[PDB]
Protein backbone atom coordinates (compact mmCIF):
# COMPACT_ATOMS: atom_id res chain seq x y z
CA UNK A 1 0.00 0.00 0.00
CA UNK A 2 2.57 2.57 1.17
CA UNK A 3 5.38 0.15 0.24
CA UNK A 4 5.53 1.35 -3.40
CA UNK A 5 5.79 5.07 -2.56
CA UNK A 6 8.99 6.98 -1.84
CA UNK A 7 8.51 10.38 -0.19
CA UNK A 8 10.46 13.19 -1.86
CA UNK A 9 9.70 16.36 0.14
CA UNK A 10 6.97 18.30 1.96
CA UNK A 11 4.85 20.52 -0.27
CA UNK A 12 2.67 22.20 2.36
CA UNK A 13 -0.37 22.13 4.60
CA UNK A 14 -3.93 22.73 3.41
CA UNK A 15 -7.34 22.67 5.13
CA UNK A 16 -6.17 19.60 7.01
CA UNK A 17 -3.42 17.01 6.77
CA UNK A 18 0.02 17.30 5.22
CA UNK A 19 0.85 17.04 1.53
CA UNK A 20 4.08 15.39 0.33
CA UNK A 21 5.62 14.99 -3.10
CA UNK A 22 6.21 11.27 -3.65
CA UNK A 23 7.09 8.78 -6.37
CA UNK A 24 5.53 5.45 -7.29
CA UNK A 25 8.54 3.11 -7.44
CA UNK A 26 7.03 0.54 -9.81
CA UNK A 27 5.41 2.84 -12.40
CA UNK A 28 7.56 5.96 -11.93
CA UNK A 29 4.45 8.11 -11.45
CA UNK A 30 5.08 11.24 -9.39
CA UNK A 31 2.16 11.86 -7.01
CA UNK A 32 1.04 14.15 -4.20
CA UNK A 33 0.28 12.37 -0.89
CA UNK A 34 -2.22 13.88 1.54
CA UNK A 35 -1.51 12.35 4.97
CA UNK A 36 -4.25 12.37 7.62
CA UNK A 37 -3.43 11.31 11.19
CA UNK A 38 -6.43 9.71 12.92
CA UNK A 39 -13.39 12.13 17.04
CA UNK A 40 -12.96 9.78 14.06
CA UNK A 41 -12.61 10.57 10.35
CA UNK A 42 -12.86 14.37 9.85
CA UNK A 43 -15.84 15.79 7.96
CA UNK A 44 -13.43 17.74 5.75
CA UNK A 45 -11.86 14.44 4.62
CA UNK A 46 -15.26 12.74 4.30
CA UNK A 47 -16.44 15.57 2.04
CA UNK A 48 -13.19 15.87 0.08
CA UNK A 49 -12.94 12.16 -0.75
CA UNK A 50 -16.62 11.56 -1.59
CA UNK A 51 -16.79 14.64 -3.83
CA UNK A 52 -13.41 14.11 -5.56
CA UNK A 53 -14.33 10.53 -6.55
CA UNK A 54 -17.34 11.92 -8.47
CA UNK A 55 -15.44 14.86 -9.99
CA UNK A 56 -13.43 13.64 -12.99
CA UNK A 57 -12.33 16.63 -15.05
CA UNK A 58 -9.07 17.88 -16.65
CA UNK A 59 -9.14 21.07 -14.50
CA UNK A 60 -9.88 19.42 -11.16
CA UNK A 61 -7.01 17.74 -9.30
CA UNK A 62 -7.42 13.99 -9.74
CA UNK A 63 -7.83 11.70 -6.73
CA UNK A 64 -6.01 8.48 -7.68
CA UNK A 65 -6.31 6.25 -4.59
CA UNK A 66 -7.39 6.18 -0.93
CA UNK A 67 -5.18 4.13 1.40
CA UNK A 68 -6.42 3.04 4.84
CA UNK A 69 -3.29 1.88 6.66
CA UNK A 70 -2.59 1.31 10.38
CA UNK A 71 -3.58 4.58 12.15
CA UNK A 72 -3.35 6.83 9.06
CA UNK A 73 -5.39 7.83 6.01
CA UNK A 74 -3.42 8.56 2.83
CA UNK A 75 -4.89 10.30 -0.21
CA UNK A 76 -2.98 9.83 -3.48
CA UNK A 77 -3.40 12.67 -6.02
CA UNK A 78 -1.93 13.54 -9.41
CA UNK A 79 1.12 15.75 -8.81
CA UNK A 80 1.14 19.32 -10.06
CA UNK A 81 4.32 21.41 -10.22
CA UNK A 82 3.52 24.82 -8.69
CA UNK A 83 0.65 26.91 -7.29
CA UNK A 84 -0.60 30.09 -8.99
CA UNK A 85 0.60 32.33 -6.14
CA UNK A 86 4.26 31.27 -6.45
CA UNK A 87 3.88 31.63 -10.24
CA UNK A 88 2.65 35.23 -9.94
CA UNK A 89 5.59 36.09 -7.66
CA UNK A 90 7.99 34.63 -10.24
CA UNK A 91 6.33 36.97 -12.79
CA UNK A 92 7.19 40.07 -10.69
CA UNK A 93 9.18 41.90 -13.40
CA UNK A 94 7.95 40.34 -16.65
CA UNK A 95 4.26 39.96 -15.81
CA UNK A 96 2.02 37.13 -16.99
CA UNK A 97 1.45 37.16 -20.78
CA UNK A 98 -2.19 37.80 -21.70
CA UNK A 99 -2.61 34.50 -23.59
CA UNK A 100 -1.62 32.67 -20.39
CA UNK A 101 -3.97 34.67 -18.14
CA UNK A 102 -6.76 34.08 -20.68
CA UNK A 103 -5.99 30.35 -20.90
CA UNK A 104 -5.87 29.98 -17.10
CA UNK A 105 -9.17 31.82 -16.61
CA UNK A 106 -10.90 29.73 -19.30
CA UNK A 107 -9.65 26.49 -17.72
CA UNK A 108 -10.69 27.59 -14.21
CA UNK A 109 -14.16 28.42 -15.48
CA UNK A 110 -14.38 24.95 -17.03
CA UNK A 111 -13.31 23.41 -13.74
CA UNK A 112 -15.86 25.50 -11.88
CA UNK A 113 -18.73 24.83 -14.32
CA UNK A 114 -18.15 21.09 -13.91
CA UNK A 115 -18.21 21.42 -10.08
CA UNK A 116 -21.42 23.46 -10.10
CA UNK A 117 -23.12 21.10 -12.61
CA UNK A 118 -22.40 18.29 -10.15
CA UNK A 119 -23.88 20.21 -7.20
CA UNK A 120 -20.47 21.03 -5.63
CA UNK A 121 -19.41 24.34 -4.06
CA UNK A 122 -15.64 24.78 -3.68
CA UNK A 123 -15.76 27.71 -1.21
CA UNK A 124 -12.00 28.26 -1.00
CA UNK A 125 -10.77 29.57 -4.34
CA UNK A 126 -7.49 31.46 -3.88
CA UNK A 127 -4.14 31.42 -5.74
CA UNK A 128 -2.60 28.89 -3.30
CA UNK A 129 -5.32 26.32 -4.23
CA UNK A 130 -4.91 26.72 -8.00
CA UNK A 131 -2.22 24.38 -9.32
CA UNK A 132 -0.31 24.55 -12.61
CA UNK A 133 1.81 22.08 -14.58
CA UNK A 134 4.53 22.33 -17.28
CA UNK A 135 2.08 21.60 -20.14
CA UNK A 136 -0.06 24.68 -19.40
CA UNK A 137 -2.91 23.19 -17.38
CA UNK A 138 -4.38 24.88 -14.29
CA UNK A 139 -6.44 22.84 -11.81
CA UNK A 140 -8.70 23.32 -8.78
CA UNK A 141 -7.28 21.76 -5.62
CA UNK A 142 -7.96 21.50 -1.88
CA UNK A 143 -11.61 20.45 -1.74
CA UNK A 144 -11.45 20.27 2.09
CA UNK A 145 -13.78 23.25 2.38
CA UNK A 146 -16.15 22.08 -0.36
CA UNK A 147 -19.68 20.75 0.03
CA UNK A 148 -22.50 19.16 -1.97
CA UNK A 149 -25.44 21.56 -2.25
CA UNK A 150 -29.17 21.13 -2.82
CA UNK A 151 -31.64 22.73 -5.20
CA UNK A 152 -32.67 25.11 -3.89
CA UNK A 153 -29.86 25.66 -1.36
CA UNK A 154 -30.29 25.63 2.43
CA UNK A 155 -28.33 27.76 4.87
CA UNK A 156 -24.78 26.36 4.95
CA UNK A 157 -21.67 27.19 7.05
CA UNK A 158 -21.19 30.96 7.43
CA UNK A 159 -17.38 30.87 7.91
CA UNK A 160 -16.53 30.14 4.31
CA UNK A 161 -13.93 31.54 1.89
CA UNK A 162 -10.58 33.15 2.73
CA UNK A 163 -11.32 36.83 3.47
CA UNK A 164 -9.70 38.44 0.40
CA UNK A 165 -11.80 36.33 -2.01
CA UNK A 166 -15.04 36.35 0.04
CA UNK A 167 -18.27 37.40 -1.73
CA UNK A 168 -20.42 40.39 -0.54
CA UNK A 169 -23.39 38.10 0.23
CA UNK A 170 -21.27 36.17 2.74
CA UNK A 171 -19.88 39.38 4.32
CA UNK A 172 -23.41 40.85 4.59
CA UNK A 173 -24.71 37.55 6.04
CA UNK A 174 -27.50 36.46 3.62
CA UNK A 175 -29.45 33.34 4.67
CA UNK A 176 -28.53 31.75 1.36
CA UNK A 177 -25.40 31.66 -0.74
CA UNK A 178 -24.70 29.51 -3.77
CA UNK A 179 -22.53 28.99 -6.88
CA UNK A 180 -22.03 32.77 -7.25
CA UNK A 181 -19.56 32.84 -4.34
CA UNK A 182 -17.04 30.77 -6.33
CA UNK A 183 -17.48 33.11 -9.31
CA UNK A 184 -16.72 36.12 -7.07
CA UNK A 185 -13.48 34.48 -5.92
CA UNK A 186 -12.51 33.79 -9.56
CA UNK A 187 -13.19 37.44 -10.47
CA UNK A 188 -10.80 38.53 -7.71
CA UNK A 189 -8.27 36.03 -9.06
CA UNK A 190 -8.70 37.36 -12.64
CA UNK A 191 -7.88 40.88 -11.39
CA UNK A 192 -4.95 39.46 -9.39
CA UNK A 193 -3.38 37.61 -12.36
CA UNK A 194 -3.32 40.95 -14.23
CA UNK A 195 -2.07 43.36 -11.52
CA UNK A 196 -0.25 40.65 -9.48
CA UNK A 197 -1.64 42.14 -6.28
CA UNK A 198 -4.79 41.17 -4.36
CA UNK A 199 -7.87 43.13 -5.42
CA UNK A 200 -9.40 43.49 -1.95
CA UNK A 201 -6.69 42.84 0.68
CA UNK A 202 -8.71 43.49 3.87
CA UNK A 203 -7.92 42.22 7.38
CA UNK A 204 -11.42 42.31 8.84
CA UNK A 205 -14.94 41.76 7.52
CA UNK A 206 -15.78 45.49 7.75
CA UNK A 207 -12.44 46.46 6.13
CA UNK A 208 -13.18 43.94 3.34
CA UNK A 209 -16.67 45.35 2.68
CA UNK A 210 -15.35 48.95 2.60
CA UNK A 211 -12.53 48.09 0.15
CA UNK A 212 -15.12 46.41 -2.10
CA UNK A 213 -17.48 49.42 -1.77
CA UNK A 214 -14.66 51.87 -2.65
CA UNK A 215 -14.01 49.94 -5.86
CA UNK A 216 -17.49 48.99 -7.03
CA UNK A 217 -19.60 51.61 -5.26
CA UNK A 218 -21.67 51.14 -2.13
CA UNK A 219 -24.59 48.94 -3.29
CA UNK A 220 -28.06 50.46 -3.12
CA UNK A 221 -31.49 48.87 -3.68
CA UNK A 222 -31.25 49.64 -7.42
CA UNK A 223 -28.05 47.67 -8.06
CA UNK A 224 -28.87 44.94 -5.50
CA UNK A 225 -32.53 44.65 -4.41
CA UNK A 226 -32.85 43.52 -0.78
CA UNK A 227 -29.35 44.70 0.23
CA UNK A 228 -30.49 47.27 2.83
CA UNK A 229 -32.39 44.45 4.62
CA UNK A 230 -29.46 42.03 4.88
CA UNK A 231 -28.41 41.07 8.46
CA UNK A 232 -24.99 42.76 8.44
CA UNK A 233 -25.94 45.83 6.41
CA UNK A 234 -25.73 49.11 8.32
CA UNK A 235 -27.43 52.34 7.17
CA UNK A 236 -24.31 54.13 8.50
CA UNK A 237 -22.17 52.55 5.71
CA UNK A 238 -20.31 55.26 3.76
CA UNK A 239 -21.80 55.68 0.28
CA UNK A 240 -18.90 55.55 -2.17
CA UNK A 241 -19.42 56.34 -5.85
CA UNK A 242 -18.72 53.58 -8.38
CA UNK A 243 -15.49 54.46 -10.14
CA UNK A 244 -14.54 54.15 -13.82
CA UNK A 245 -14.29 50.36 -14.16
CA UNK A 246 -11.30 50.79 -16.54
CA UNK A 247 -9.39 52.14 -13.53
CA UNK A 248 -9.95 48.94 -11.51
CA UNK A 249 -7.63 46.77 -13.67
CA UNK A 250 -6.04 49.31 -16.08
CA UNK A 251 -4.20 46.89 -18.45
CA UNK A 252 -7.49 45.18 -19.29
CA UNK A 253 -9.17 46.03 -22.56
CA UNK A 254 -12.90 46.13 -23.38
CA UNK A 255 -13.70 42.38 -23.48
CA UNK A 256 -11.74 41.62 -20.28
CA UNK A 257 -13.25 44.57 -18.43
CA UNK A 258 -16.74 43.40 -19.45
CA UNK A 259 -16.11 39.86 -18.19
CA UNK A 260 -14.59 41.05 -14.88
CA UNK A 261 -17.54 43.39 -14.23
CA UNK A 262 -20.00 40.51 -14.77
CA UNK A 263 -18.00 38.31 -12.36
CA UNK A 264 -17.96 41.10 -9.73
CA UNK A 265 -21.67 41.97 -9.94
CA UNK A 266 -23.13 42.63 -6.47
CA UNK A 267 -26.38 40.74 -7.02
CA UNK A 268 -25.61 36.98 -6.92
CA UNK A 269 -28.58 36.41 -9.29
CA UNK A 270 -27.08 38.75 -11.89
CA UNK A 271 -23.48 37.56 -11.42
CA UNK A 272 -22.36 35.51 -14.44
CA UNK A 273 -22.24 31.72 -14.14
CA UNK A 274 -19.07 29.80 -15.03
CA UNK A 275 -20.99 28.07 -17.82
CA UNK A 276 -22.11 31.37 -19.42
CA UNK A 277 -18.63 32.92 -18.98
CA UNK A 278 -17.05 30.23 -21.19
CA UNK A 279 -18.71 31.88 -24.21
CA UNK A 280 -17.72 35.48 -23.38
CA UNK A 281 -16.04 37.34 -26.32
CA UNK A 282 -12.92 37.66 -24.14
CA UNK A 283 -12.17 34.01 -24.95
CA UNK A 284 -12.64 34.18 -28.74
CA UNK A 285 -8.88 33.87 -29.37
CA UNK A 286 -8.07 31.58 -26.41
CA UNK A 287 -5.27 28.99 -26.79
CA UNK A 288 -3.38 26.75 -24.33
CA UNK A 289 0.33 27.70 -24.23
CA UNK A 290 2.86 26.25 -21.77
CA UNK A 291 3.96 28.50 -18.90
CA UNK A 292 6.51 31.03 -20.15
CA UNK A 293 8.72 30.18 -17.13
CA UNK A 294 10.57 27.23 -15.54
Amino acid sequence: SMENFQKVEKIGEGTYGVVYKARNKLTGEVVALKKIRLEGVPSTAIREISLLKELNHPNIVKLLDVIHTENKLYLVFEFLHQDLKKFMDASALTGIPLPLIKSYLFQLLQGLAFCHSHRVLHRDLKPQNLLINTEGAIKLADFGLARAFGVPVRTYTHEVVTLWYRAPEILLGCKYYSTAVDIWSLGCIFAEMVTRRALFPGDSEIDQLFRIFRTLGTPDEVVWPGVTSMPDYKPSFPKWARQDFSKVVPPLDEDGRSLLSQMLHYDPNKRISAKAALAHPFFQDVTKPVPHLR
Binding site: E39, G40, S43, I49, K53, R119, V151
Partner: protein, 257 residues
Protein backbone atom coordinates in the same frame (compact mmCIF):
# COMPACT_ATOMS: atom_id res chain seq x y z
CA UNK B 1 -31.00 28.26 -12.04
CA UNK B 2 -28.38 27.86 -14.76
CA UNK B 3 -27.55 24.42 -13.29
CA UNK B 4 -30.92 22.97 -12.21
CA UNK B 5 -31.28 20.77 -15.34
CA UNK B 6 -27.64 19.55 -15.22
CA UNK B 7 -27.95 18.74 -11.49
CA UNK B 8 -31.27 16.91 -11.90
CA UNK B 9 -29.84 14.85 -14.79
CA UNK B 10 -26.75 14.06 -12.69
CA UNK B 11 -28.82 12.97 -9.69
CA UNK B 12 -30.96 10.72 -11.93
CA UNK B 13 -27.74 8.97 -13.02
CA UNK B 14 -26.36 8.66 -9.47
CA UNK B 15 -29.53 7.29 -7.83
CA UNK B 16 -29.22 4.22 -10.10
CA UNK B 17 -25.55 3.72 -9.11
CA UNK B 18 -26.18 4.44 -5.40
CA UNK B 19 -29.18 2.11 -5.16
CA UNK B 20 -29.32 -0.68 -2.54
CA UNK B 21 -29.82 -4.33 -3.55
CA UNK B 22 -33.60 -4.94 -3.60
CA UNK B 23 -33.65 -8.45 -2.09
CA UNK B 24 -30.92 -8.12 0.56
CA UNK B 25 -33.11 -8.76 3.62
CA UNK B 26 -33.84 -12.33 2.45
CA UNK B 27 -30.07 -12.96 2.38
CA UNK B 28 -29.61 -11.62 5.93
CA UNK B 29 -29.85 -14.55 8.37
CA UNK B 30 -30.50 -12.69 11.64
CA UNK B 31 -32.24 -9.41 10.77
CA UNK B 32 -35.73 -8.74 9.39
CA UNK B 33 -37.75 -5.91 7.81
CA UNK B 34 -39.28 -5.40 11.25
CA UNK B 35 -35.88 -4.96 12.92
CA UNK B 36 -34.84 -2.44 10.25
CA UNK B 37 -38.15 -0.57 10.74
CA UNK B 38 -37.37 -0.28 14.47
CA UNK B 39 -33.86 0.99 13.65
CA UNK B 40 -35.08 3.69 11.21
CA UNK B 41 -37.78 4.82 13.66
CA UNK B 42 -35.10 5.22 16.36
CA UNK B 43 -32.94 7.27 13.95
CA UNK B 44 -35.93 9.60 13.49
CA UNK B 45 -35.95 10.05 17.31
CA UNK B 46 -32.19 10.76 17.26
CA UNK B 47 -32.67 13.36 14.49
CA UNK B 48 -35.46 15.02 16.50
CA UNK B 49 -33.38 15.17 19.68
CA UNK B 50 -30.32 16.72 18.01
CA UNK B 51 -32.28 18.91 15.54
CA UNK B 52 -30.70 17.24 12.49
CA UNK B 53 -31.60 17.93 8.86
CA UNK B 54 -34.13 15.62 7.22
CA UNK B 55 -31.43 15.11 4.54
CA UNK B 56 -29.11 13.64 7.21
CA UNK B 57 -31.80 11.04 8.04
CA UNK B 58 -32.27 10.10 4.38
CA UNK B 59 -28.51 9.79 3.86
CA UNK B 60 -28.03 7.60 6.95
CA UNK B 61 -30.78 5.24 5.76
CA UNK B 62 -29.13 4.98 2.31
CA UNK B 63 -25.80 4.16 4.01
CA UNK B 64 -27.42 1.42 6.10
CA UNK B 65 -29.30 -0.25 3.22
CA UNK B 66 -26.11 -0.20 1.11
CA UNK B 67 -23.99 -1.57 3.97
CA UNK B 68 -26.53 -4.34 4.64
CA UNK B 69 -26.59 -5.12 0.90
CA UNK B 70 -23.15 -6.74 1.26
CA UNK B 71 -22.53 -7.23 5.00
CA UNK B 72 -24.29 -9.78 7.21
CA UNK B 73 -25.08 -8.30 10.63
CA UNK B 74 -26.37 -9.88 13.85
CA UNK B 75 -29.43 -8.27 15.49
CA UNK B 76 -27.34 -7.07 18.47
CA UNK B 77 -25.04 -5.11 16.14
CA UNK B 78 -27.67 -3.51 13.89
CA UNK B 79 -27.94 -0.40 16.08
CA UNK B 80 -24.15 0.06 15.89
CA UNK B 81 -24.31 0.12 12.06
CA UNK B 82 -27.18 2.61 12.35
CA UNK B 83 -25.21 4.79 14.79
CA UNK B 84 -22.04 4.98 12.66
CA UNK B 85 -24.13 5.74 9.55
CA UNK B 86 -25.89 8.65 11.29
CA UNK B 87 -22.51 9.91 12.53
CA UNK B 88 -21.17 9.81 8.95
CA UNK B 89 -24.32 11.41 7.54
CA UNK B 90 -24.04 14.21 10.14
CA UNK B 91 -20.39 14.87 9.26
CA UNK B 92 -21.26 15.04 5.54
CA UNK B 93 -24.42 17.19 5.79
CA UNK B 94 -24.57 19.13 9.10
CA UNK B 95 -23.00 22.53 9.78
CA UNK B 96 -22.67 21.47 13.41
CA UNK B 97 -22.67 17.68 13.68
CA UNK B 98 -23.10 16.15 17.16
CA UNK B 99 -19.85 14.92 18.70
CA UNK B 100 -19.06 11.18 18.89
CA UNK B 101 -19.70 11.23 22.67
CA UNK B 102 -23.29 12.33 21.94
CA UNK B 103 -23.78 9.29 19.66
CA UNK B 104 -22.47 6.98 22.39
CA UNK B 105 -24.94 8.48 24.89
CA UNK B 106 -28.08 7.90 22.75
CA UNK B 107 -27.26 4.21 22.22
CA UNK B 108 -28.09 3.68 25.95
CA UNK B 109 -24.37 2.84 26.36
CA UNK B 110 -24.84 -0.45 24.50
CA UNK B 111 -21.59 0.32 22.65
CA UNK B 112 -18.27 2.02 23.47
CA UNK B 113 -16.72 5.02 21.69
CA UNK B 114 -14.09 2.67 20.23
CA UNK B 115 -16.77 0.39 18.69
CA UNK B 116 -18.61 3.34 17.13
CA UNK B 117 -15.34 4.70 15.66
CA UNK B 118 -14.28 1.31 14.28
CA UNK B 119 -17.74 0.84 12.73
CA UNK B 120 -17.44 4.30 11.11
CA UNK B 121 -14.22 3.08 9.47
CA UNK B 122 -15.83 -0.16 8.28
CA UNK B 123 -18.90 1.63 6.86
CA UNK B 124 -16.60 4.03 4.95
CA UNK B 125 -14.55 1.06 3.69
CA UNK B 126 -17.64 -0.92 2.61
CA UNK B 127 -19.24 2.10 0.88
CA UNK B 128 -15.78 2.99 -0.56
CA UNK B 129 -16.28 6.57 0.71
CA UNK B 130 -19.17 7.18 -1.72
CA UNK B 131 -21.45 9.24 0.53
CA UNK B 132 -22.88 11.93 -1.78
CA UNK B 133 -25.97 9.84 -2.58
CA UNK B 134 -29.26 11.16 -4.02
CA UNK B 135 -32.22 11.03 -1.66
CA UNK B 136 -36.00 11.39 -1.84
CA UNK B 137 -35.49 14.72 -0.08
CA UNK B 138 -33.14 16.07 -2.78
CA UNK B 139 -35.71 15.37 -5.50
CA UNK B 140 -38.62 16.77 -3.44
CA UNK B 141 -36.98 20.19 -2.98
CA UNK B 142 -36.57 20.37 -6.77
CA UNK B 143 -40.19 19.29 -7.38
CA UNK B 144 -41.40 21.95 -4.90
CA UNK B 145 -40.21 24.68 -7.30
CA UNK B 146 -43.07 23.63 -9.65
CA UNK B 147 -45.93 24.65 -7.31
CA UNK B 148 -48.36 27.34 -8.50
CA UNK B 149 -48.42 28.94 -6.04
CA UNK B 150 -46.08 27.63 -3.31
CA UNK B 151 -47.85 25.86 -0.42
CA UNK B 152 -46.14 25.06 2.90
CA UNK B 153 -48.59 22.29 3.82
CA UNK B 154 -48.00 20.48 0.50
CA UNK B 155 -44.23 20.73 1.07
CA UNK B 156 -44.36 19.38 4.63
CA UNK B 157 -46.87 16.65 3.71
CA UNK B 158 -44.62 15.52 0.82
CA UNK B 159 -41.66 15.34 3.23
CA UNK B 160 -43.83 13.44 5.74
CA UNK B 161 -44.86 10.81 3.15
CA UNK B 162 -41.31 10.53 1.79
CA UNK B 163 -40.08 9.92 5.34
CA UNK B 164 -42.62 7.11 5.97
CA UNK B 165 -41.23 5.29 2.91
CA UNK B 166 -37.92 4.98 4.81
CA UNK B 167 -39.50 2.76 7.47
CA UNK B 168 -40.72 -0.15 5.31
CA UNK B 169 -38.14 -1.93 3.09
CA UNK B 170 -41.02 -3.96 1.66
CA UNK B 171 -42.02 -2.43 -0.58
CA UNK B 172 -40.08 0.86 -0.88
CA UNK B 173 -36.61 -0.59 -1.50
CA UNK B 174 -37.68 -1.39 -5.08
CA UNK B 175 -38.43 2.25 -5.92
CA UNK B 176 -35.85 4.91 -6.85
CA UNK B 177 -35.72 8.16 -4.78
CA UNK B 178 -36.95 10.27 -7.73
CA UNK B 179 -40.03 8.04 -8.18
CA UNK B 180 -40.90 7.97 -4.46
CA UNK B 181 -40.53 11.76 -4.38
CA UNK B 182 -42.83 11.92 -7.41
CA UNK B 183 -45.53 9.88 -5.69
CA UNK B 184 -45.11 11.75 -2.40
CA UNK B 185 -45.37 15.17 -4.06
CA UNK B 186 -48.43 14.11 -6.04
CA UNK B 187 -50.11 12.58 -2.98
CA UNK B 188 -49.44 15.70 -0.87
CA UNK B 189 -50.63 17.99 -3.67
CA UNK B 190 -53.85 16.00 -4.08
CA UNK B 191 -54.55 15.78 -0.33
CA UNK B 192 -54.11 19.51 0.36
CA UNK B 193 -55.24 21.26 -2.86
CA UNK B 194 -56.95 18.63 -5.04
CA UNK B 195 -54.31 19.25 -7.73
CA UNK B 196 -52.26 16.66 -9.61
CA UNK B 197 -48.68 16.03 -10.75
CA UNK B 198 -48.12 19.08 -12.99
CA UNK B 199 -47.29 19.05 -16.71
CA UNK B 200 -44.08 20.99 -16.02
CA UNK B 201 -42.77 18.01 -14.00
CA UNK B 202 -43.66 15.52 -16.75
CA UNK B 203 -41.47 17.74 -18.91
CA UNK B 204 -38.63 17.71 -16.33
CA UNK B 205 -38.72 14.11 -15.08
CA UNK B 206 -40.36 12.14 -17.88
CA UNK B 207 -42.69 10.65 -15.25
CA UNK B 208 -46.48 10.67 -15.60
CA UNK B 209 -49.26 9.58 -13.23
CA UNK B 210 -49.20 6.27 -15.15
CA UNK B 211 -45.52 5.51 -14.37
CA UNK B 212 -45.91 6.81 -10.79
CA UNK B 213 -49.02 4.68 -10.12
CA UNK B 214 -47.42 1.51 -8.65
CA UNK B 215 -45.46 3.54 -6.07
CA UNK B 216 -48.44 5.84 -5.56
CA UNK B 217 -50.79 2.92 -4.76
CA UNK B 218 -48.35 1.66 -2.11
CA UNK B 219 -47.77 5.14 -0.64
CA UNK B 220 -51.54 5.74 -0.50
CA UNK B 221 -51.98 2.58 1.62
CA UNK B 222 -49.04 3.46 3.90
CA UNK B 223 -50.62 6.91 4.38
CA UNK B 224 -53.98 5.30 5.23
CA UNK B 225 -52.46 2.78 7.69
CA UNK B 226 -49.95 5.22 9.27
CA UNK B 227 -51.85 5.75 12.58
CA UNK B 228 -51.97 1.95 13.09
CA UNK B 229 -48.29 1.26 12.19
CA UNK B 230 -46.02 -0.14 14.95
CA UNK B 231 -43.49 2.69 14.43
CA UNK B 232 -44.88 6.14 15.29
CA UNK B 233 -41.87 8.53 15.55
CA UNK B 234 -42.49 10.15 12.14
CA UNK B 235 -46.15 10.89 12.90
CA UNK B 236 -45.12 12.42 16.26
CA UNK B 237 -42.42 14.48 14.54
CA UNK B 238 -44.82 15.86 11.90
CA UNK B 239 -47.30 17.11 14.51
CA UNK B 240 -44.87 19.97 15.23
CA UNK B 241 -45.53 23.48 13.88
CA UNK B 242 -42.14 23.31 12.13
CA UNK B 243 -43.83 20.99 9.62
CA UNK B 244 -47.24 22.72 9.86
CA UNK B 245 -48.83 19.78 11.75
CA UNK B 246 -49.42 17.90 8.48
CA UNK B 247 -49.62 14.45 10.10
CA UNK B 248 -52.97 15.63 11.51
CA UNK B 249 -54.38 15.95 7.98
CA UNK B 250 -56.79 13.23 6.83
CA UNK B 251 -55.65 11.08 3.89
CA UNK B 252 -57.96 10.90 0.87
CA UNK B 253 -60.13 7.77 0.69
CA UNK B 254 -59.52 7.38 -3.08
CA UNK B 255 -57.01 8.76 -5.60
CA UNK B 256 -59.23 8.49 -8.72
CA UNK B 257 -56.36 7.51 -11.05
Amino acid sequence: PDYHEDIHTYLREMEVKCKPKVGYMKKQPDITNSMRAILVDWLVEVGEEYKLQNETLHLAVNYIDRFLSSMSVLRGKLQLVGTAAMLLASKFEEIYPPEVAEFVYITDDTYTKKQVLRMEHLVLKVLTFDLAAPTVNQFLTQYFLHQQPANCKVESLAMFLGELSLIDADPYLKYLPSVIAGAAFHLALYTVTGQSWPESLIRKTGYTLESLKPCLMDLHQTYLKAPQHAQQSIREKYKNSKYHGVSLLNPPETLNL
